[PDB]
């Protein structure tokens, strides 16, 4: 009802003092030698952890803008995460220094449209400058390396991610999943990952990942928008018959129909899942009987006649694993005549020689090479089973971190990337003298990771700064050893992706907030 509303210096402050606890709560985690912050749990046994993204997570306020501004704050950080795979803690650190300074000179007079508008310009420019400097990772010894570096020094995680992305393509879809035994198994099977994502979260088996696993299930392909139940209630009882998970692949299933199967999946009488069908218009049609196609069943499409309420399980497709994400599935080996597979593909070539625009040849390539690789699994061996899953993880992590650097490329890790872009744009201005100072406060933010990492590493951030400025290429400073060299002789690297989403998400929050006149939020 009643809500506060604050204006002008006092919000600004307010959420300027948040940011502040958020990232002192954070940035103590930042670098090799991280500090660890102690979460209490109402459980009783305190958790210690020196990942930011835990802390990042569990933070939260108890003044309303205070909450707001680490909210959001938080919310930008978590999207650099999901998008890049890492940098929670740098996009935190960045988002708090471009803050702080920029607040520092609203607080004078300084215009906040030019100050973002020359701290956008800076940030563009920085990007630019990352993207020339990062090292190209395209061979397979590159690949291997990055797989060690990002698995904790571990020669085998890295020769099976380096194999693996061999026999897929730099650009395949590679997975990862539990493996009997303790040598290490790869092999690769007829599958097809579209990025799409669950409806609801309800649906979730593993809240490690956030992902809904599903083992052997059926998937019934709907062409149709599913609102109502009575339609495909027998298409339930029959897979509950049957024993096994079902995965709902429609246009959109929402309302009744999405209340009541994820009333049944928390009930847990029976485990089905509903993820939306990728793609819009002929293409999604397409798709729909590539997946099909690829699992040996068929589509149930309301054009031709055909009602769900015949849907059984002689037309219902069935797969090996089914992996459902946030933003992306992935069905693995769908069991499925590898004629009718190759006779798709033989036709989707076609279309694509008798395809006149470049859109829909370059979206044909797209669909027939996504259908025609298929899907890699490695699964993974060790002694005991909860080392199985930390080195699981470990794989995951890596293969998260490979891709990112197969992507955009390699960069010198620790911070001194954006040191080193900050020093080469030492000469960038604006159009008006606001633009400049958004500018130094984009370098002064670009200069403040390294120095957190630093501080925690217990020597002064100033002079081994100043140090590492000095010096040119990927040169810097090693928290570890606490020596200098090449981060990527010494490797020490991250994928350039992850500093520049890091670097792009905290100029859009710092620009969001710079330019915040007024909050509104409920009274206490």
Known sequence: AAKDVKFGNDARVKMLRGVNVLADAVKVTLGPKGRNVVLDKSFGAPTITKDGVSVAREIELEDKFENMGAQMVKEVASKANDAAGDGTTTATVLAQAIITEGLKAVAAGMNPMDLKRGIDK?????????????????????????????????????????????????????????????????????????????LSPYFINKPETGAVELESPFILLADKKISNIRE??????????????????????????????????????????AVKAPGFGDRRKAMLQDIATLTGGTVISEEIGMELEKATLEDLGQAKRVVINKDTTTIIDGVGEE???????????????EATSDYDREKLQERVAKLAGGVAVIKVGAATEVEMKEKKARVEDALHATRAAVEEGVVAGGGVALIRVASKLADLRGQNEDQNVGIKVALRAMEAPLRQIVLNCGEEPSVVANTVKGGDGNYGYNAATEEYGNMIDMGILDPTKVTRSALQYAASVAGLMITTECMVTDLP
């Not at 998970?245 to 847990?268: H, K, S």
């Open 122 to 198: 800076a940030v563009t420019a920085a990007v630019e400058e990352l993207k020339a400097l990062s090292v190209p990772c395209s061979d397979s010894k590159a690949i291997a390396q990055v797989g060690t570096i990002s698995a904790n020094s571990d020669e085998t995680v890295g020769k099976l991610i380096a194999e693996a992305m061999d026999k897929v393509g730099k650009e395949g879809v590679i997975t990862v999943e539990d493996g009997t035994g303790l040598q290490d198994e790869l092999d690769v099977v007829e599958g097809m990952q579209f990025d799409r994502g669950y």
């Open 232 to 273: 495909m209630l027998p298409v339930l009882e029959a897979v509950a018959k049957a024993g096994k998970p079902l995965l709902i692949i429609a246009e959109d299933v929402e309302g009744e129909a999405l209340a009541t199967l994820v009333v049944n999946t928390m009930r847990g009488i029976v485990k089905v899942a």
């Open 339 to 353: 004629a009718a597979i190759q006779g798709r593909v033989a036709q989707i070539r076609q279309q694509i020689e």
